[PDB]
């Protein structure tokens, strides 16, 4: 209720990312143009509208391997998967179009909105 | 040179608590005598020294049912489980001893520290 620990959510995310690094309790591999990325389905559901919609179905929820569209940039996905587990992203001239496209595909509204703003600032 | 999303970690935790409420992707039941609590082992590992220590062993990491000491106050546990998933605690005269004892059992050092400070101010 009234007492909050201000670093708690960030510490939880840090520890979740450590479990990912160690391959502890990971339950899915995402495949993007023949590159593989291990993850926790709970984190994917909590961060992406696409994964949320897919994994609410019990059948697709049980899948151990999930393929993304073969036109998705794996580095864009890598960037966004690391964002899920850290809250941080490098948004720069050389990657903004791939990140925005990938964030649109994953239904990550706040990243999309930020990308939009950054693109509009450069006309 | 990174960009940070200030609400991300709190939003992730909110959505994980939503998944717990809906019993989505929960992989353990924590038993305290006759009371039962469904949870995500990843969240347990990320917040409690006890759960981190036992779940480093693959054998215990695989358990679907975990029993706590039946002398544990189950509302004390419930308070602390909700804290893991929200960052928030109601700490007050009538519950502080039970919460403190439970936090010591669970090896939740920051909660124990804050309980200690609150108790000391009432001496």
């Amino acid at each position: 209720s009234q007492i909050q620990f201000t670093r708690h959510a960030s510490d939880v995310l840090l520890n979740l990312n450590r479990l990912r690094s160690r391959d502890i309790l990971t339950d899915v591999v995402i495949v993007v143009s023949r590159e593989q990325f291990r993850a926790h389905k709970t984190v994917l559901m909590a961060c992406s509208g696409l994964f949320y919609s897919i994994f609410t179905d019990q059948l697709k929820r049980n899948l151990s391997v999930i393929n993304l569209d073969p036109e998705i940039n794996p580095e864009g996905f890598n960037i966004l998967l690391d964002f899920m587990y850290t809250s941080r992203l490098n948004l720069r001239e050389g990657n903004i179009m791939a990140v925005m496209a990938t964030a649109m595909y994953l239904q990550m509204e706040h990243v999309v909105d930020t990308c939009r703003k950054f693109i509009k600032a450069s006309e | 040179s990174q960009i940070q999303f200030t609400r991300h970690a709190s939003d992730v935790l909110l959505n994980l608590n939503r998944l717990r409420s809906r019993d989505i992707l929960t992989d353990v039941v924590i038993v305290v005598s006759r009371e039962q609590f469904r949870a995500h082992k990843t969240v347990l590992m990320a917040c409690s020294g006890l759960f981190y220590s036992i779940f480093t062993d693959q054998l215990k990491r695989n358990l679907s049912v975990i029993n706590l000491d039946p002398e544990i106050n189950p509302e004390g546990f419930n308070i602390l489980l909700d804290f893991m998933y929200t960052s928030r605690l109601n700490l007050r005269e009538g519950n502080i001893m039970a919460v403190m004892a439970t936090a010591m059992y669970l090896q939740m050092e920051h909660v124990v520290d804050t309980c200690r400070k609150f108790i000391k101010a009432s001496e």
Binding site: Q2, I3, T6, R7 | R88, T114
Partner: peptide, 6 residues
């Protein structure tokens, strides 16, 4: 640390 949720 801890703070008031508010």
């Amino acid at each position: 640390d801890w703070c008031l949720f508010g």
